[PDB]
Amino acid sequence: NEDLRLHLLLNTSVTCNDGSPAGYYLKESRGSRRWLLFLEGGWYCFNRENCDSRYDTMRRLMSSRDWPRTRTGTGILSSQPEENPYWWNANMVFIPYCSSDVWSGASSKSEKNEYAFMGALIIQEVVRELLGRGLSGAKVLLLAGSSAGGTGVLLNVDRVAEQLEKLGYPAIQVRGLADSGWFLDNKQYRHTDCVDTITCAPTEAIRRGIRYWNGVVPERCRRQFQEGEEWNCFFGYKVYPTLRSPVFVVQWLFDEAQLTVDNVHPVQEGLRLYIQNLGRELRHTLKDVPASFAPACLSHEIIIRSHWTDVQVKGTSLPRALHCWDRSLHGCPVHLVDSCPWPHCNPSCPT
Numbered sequence: 612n613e614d615l616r617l618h619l620l621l622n623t624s625v626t627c628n629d630g631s632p633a634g635y636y637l638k639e640s641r642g643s644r645r646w647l648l649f650l651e652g653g654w655y656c657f658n659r660e661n662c663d664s665r666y667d668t669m670r671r672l673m674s675s676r677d678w679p680r681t682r683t684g685t686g687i688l689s690s691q692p693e694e695n696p697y698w699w700n701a702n703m704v705f706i707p708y709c710s711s712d713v714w715s716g717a718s719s720k721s722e723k724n725e726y727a728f729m730g731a732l733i734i735q736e737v738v739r740e741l742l743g744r745g746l747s748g749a750k751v752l753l754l755a756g757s758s759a760g761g762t763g764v765l766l767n768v769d770r771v772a773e774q775l776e777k778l779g780y781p782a783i784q785v786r787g788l789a790d791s792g793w794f795l796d797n798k799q800y801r802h803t804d805c806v807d808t809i810t811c812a813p814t815e816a817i818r819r820g821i822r823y824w825n826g827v828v829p830e831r832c833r834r835q836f837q838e839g840e841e842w843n844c845f846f847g848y849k850v851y852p853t854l855r856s857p858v859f860v861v862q863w864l865f866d867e868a869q870l871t872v873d874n875v876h877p878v879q880e881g882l883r884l885y886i887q888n889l890g891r892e893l894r895h896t897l898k899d900v901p902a903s904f905a906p907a908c909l910s911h912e913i914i915i916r917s918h919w920t921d922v923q924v925k926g927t928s929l930p931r932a933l934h935c936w937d938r939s940l941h942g943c944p945v946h947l948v949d950s951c952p953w954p955h956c957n958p959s960c961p962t
């Protein structure tokens with residue numbers, strides 16, 4: 612009874628990679644006008660061979676066929692006030708990641724093509740369906756997501772805001788929370804052939820991906836870059852400046868996924884400097900992001916983990932930082948970035 616319940620999209624042309632219906636999990640809180648829509652992450656695949664291995668080995672991320680009927684909300688999706696001090700009573704939605712496209716895909720596939728990439732269409736579908744189940748009464752819609760879902764937020768939040776403005780819902784304030792989705796298009800520590808998904812350099816992964824997924828990026832970002840250079844917009848620091856919606860960025864200064872795509876594994880001095888500098892460059896990209904939480908840890912994702920309340924930056928927890936931000940949009944710091952130079956120089960890093 613306390614769990615989020617699955618609904619498969621009515622529009623059966625909007626699908627996961629394998630053509631099974633996409634969907635969303637929902638727990639209504641009928642006395643609340645706040646809505647949390649969470650986009651799941653889990654990498655991506657950018658060519659046929661790699662999508663084949665992902666289908667063999669990680670079918671969950673390509674198909675709805677085995678999704679369970681319900682799932683328990685955790686972290687910012689929990690309905691327990693101890694676990695979720697300020698958002699426990701919100702309406703909760705979890706949108707599973709079954710498009711492998713960083714939530715960017717916007718075409719119905721060709722029959723010639725074998726996988727469908729419909730991440731951007733899923734989100735809009737889910738939003739439309741929600742309108743008939745309570746979202747029509749919302750005042751705040753926080754679009755949140757972790758890892759590829761955090762990148763998804765940056766790519767989709769202004770489109771959700773535009774969609775709701777266009778459909779006649781001017782009172783719904785659309786906001787984003789991007790967790791572990793803020794990446795650097797940097798040079799790898801040691802350069803790889805781009806042969807597996809997880810070790811392909813981040814610039815090349817998106818360059819290929821965007822073409823393979825027929826991915827879309829926010830128009831205001833696309834305009835800033837030359838034709839063919841849309842890949843730039845998958846990078847938080849490049850897409851953020853033109854976002855109209857308020858967006859709170861949560862980012863570990865040493866994200867495990869960043870180190871993975873940078874082909875990084877007492878460390879030798881070259882490797883020490885590359886790591887320190889990675890932390891430094893990330894810190895620098897967050898300088899002009901007033902609402903951010905960036906601890907000096909090597910970790911990945913946080914907002915739906917049960918222990919998300921434990922990490923602190925300058926004495927402030929993440930749920931508290933987020934509450935300060937909420938209050939500012941409706942003494943309470945919202946800009947919280949570690950300055951220490953090595954992973955786990957913050958005592959409160961998760962394990």
Ligand SMILES: O=S(=O)(O)OC[C@H]1O[C@@](COS(=O)(=O)O)(O[C@H]2O[C@H](COS(=O)(=O)O)[C@@H](OS(=O)(=O)O)[C@H](OS(=O)(=O)O)[C@H]2OS(=O)(=O)O)[C@@H](OS(=O)(=O)O)[C@@H]1OS(=O)(=O)O
Nearest residue numbers: 642643644645697698700701702750751934937938939941
């Ligand atoms: O349980 S809820 O999910 O509805 O959230 C309750 C808390 O939401 C706030 C917003 O907090 S903030 O975003 O951090 O700033 O306000 C919302 O609830 C209050 C009180 O409603 S309640 O049923 O008595 O809890 C609403 O006020 S009122 O309509 O009853 O006058 C706010 O609506 S409004 O701004 O007046 O339109 C409502 O905001 S919203 O509609 O969700 O955007 C907190 O209240 S606040 O501190 O006054 O801003 C609530 O905190 S509380 O301790 O639970 O009261």
Ligand SMILES: *[C@@H]1O[C@H](CO)[C@@H](O)[C@H](O)[C@H]1NC(C)=O
Nearest residue numbers: 622623624625718719729732
């Ligand atoms: C179903 O979604 C498909 C693919 O996006 C779209 O072409 C079609 O218009 C949709 N139909 C309805 C009735 O929503």
Ligand SMILES: [Cl-]
Nearest residue numbers: 616617618744
């Ligand atoms: Cl129902």
